[PDB]
Amino acid sequence: NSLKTCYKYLNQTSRSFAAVIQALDGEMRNAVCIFYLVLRALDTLEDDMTISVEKKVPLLHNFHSFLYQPDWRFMESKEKDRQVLEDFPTISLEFRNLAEKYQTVIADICRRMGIGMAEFLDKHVTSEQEWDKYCHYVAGLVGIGLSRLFSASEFEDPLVGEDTERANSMGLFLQKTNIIRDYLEDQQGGREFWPQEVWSRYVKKLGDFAKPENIDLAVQCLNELITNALHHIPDVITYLSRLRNQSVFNFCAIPQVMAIATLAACYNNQQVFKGAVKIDATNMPAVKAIIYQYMEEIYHRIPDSDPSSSKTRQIISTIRTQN
Ligand SMILES: CC(C)(C)CN1C(=O)[C@@H](CC(=O)N[C@@H](CC(=O)O)C(=O)O)O[C@H](c2cccc3ccccc23)c2cc(Cl)ccc21
Numbered sequence: 001n002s003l004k005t006c007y008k009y010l011n012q013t014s015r016s017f018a019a020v021i022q023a024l025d026g027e028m029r030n031a032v033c034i035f036y037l038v039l040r041a042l043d044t045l046e047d048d049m050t051i052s053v054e055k056k057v058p059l060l061h062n063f064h065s066f067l068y069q070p071d072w073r074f075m076e077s078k079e080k081d082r083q084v085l086e087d088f089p090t091i092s093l094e095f096r097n098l099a100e101k102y103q104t105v106i107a108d109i110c111r112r113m114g115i116g117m118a119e120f121l122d123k124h125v126t127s128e129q130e131w132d133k134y135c136h137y138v139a140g141l142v143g144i145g146l147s148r149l150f151s152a153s154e155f156e157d158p159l160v161g162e163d164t165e166r167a168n169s170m171g172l173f174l175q176k177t178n179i180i181r182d183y184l185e186d187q188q189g190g191r192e193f194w195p196q197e198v199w200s201r202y203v204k205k206l207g208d209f210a211k212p213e214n215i216d217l218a219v220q221c222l223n224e225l226i227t228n229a230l231h232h233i234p235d236v237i238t239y240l241s242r243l244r245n246q247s248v249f250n251f252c253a254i255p256q257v258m259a260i261a262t263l264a265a266c267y268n269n270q271q272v273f274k275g276a277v278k279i280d281a282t283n284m285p286a287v288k289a290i291i292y293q294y295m296e297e298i299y300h301r302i303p304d305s306d307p308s309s310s311k312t313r314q315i316i317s318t319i320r321t322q323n
Contacts, residue, residue: 169235
């Protein structure tokens, strides 16, 4: 009955993606279901600003070990996805039921992610390089993990788990688009993730973008971050083009298409700072076309006076004439 509970939580923590996960072949289903729920618990902890950094550090660091602590649970989370923490033993139970080859992979990502969450908890994301570093820790590693799980089940060639660079890029693409899109929500939640070296060139404090009077500078920085994000497209197309399993393809392609759609909607969009912006992926050729169309949507919107105009155009030309 535990597995059932796990699937109930999955649907509770996922609005639409649960259907896609449940559609995974063989062992990848339970393996990915558990992976998602465990990553959700850790995420809920990191995001919980009602918890002090003093309490969070050991929690983030010891999360991996918590997977092997049958009774461990967290009752002080005032987040939306509390239950995943509160009933963690149910999830850890099913995690220990997974094939050891899967456990090995999941535990390693959780440990590394924990170190990473703690590292950036009380410090500013400074350079764009550090932005990649953070993104790698919370989303890149997820791509690395998934890729390794895919290969371990054998539904995907061993190559998939080997190319960490490709799997990482997949994660960075999704993470950055979310950090960009969720700016206001994070501000309101007391969270900051935008690169200081980028925002300090536009405004005094990151929160200043939320102030009406600074909308023009907010949009320019927004545009610069999005241009930064586009650079992962080639790797995303490469990663996706190597997948052989249909359920895996749909699993990976859906979020990447939804991401580019989001970037396209957010690009040069003032609404990103006032609130949340409202916005075929079954074969590679179709996926490429979808991505390309969205890239053009952004291209047409490029304000010739935008500080990043030339940059945005160049990465788009690269995507256009590449793979
Ligand atoms: C932070 C994140 C991007 C890694 C979150 N993340 C994802 O974004 C989900 C998508 C999702 O659930 N979107 C939700 C968001 C919402 O509720 O509004 C939706 O319903 O549209 O997909 C990712 C995900 C799927 C496939 C390959 C990936 C490679 C690298 C990194 C992440 C990868 C994910 C896979 C797993 Cl196993 C766990 C988490 C995630």
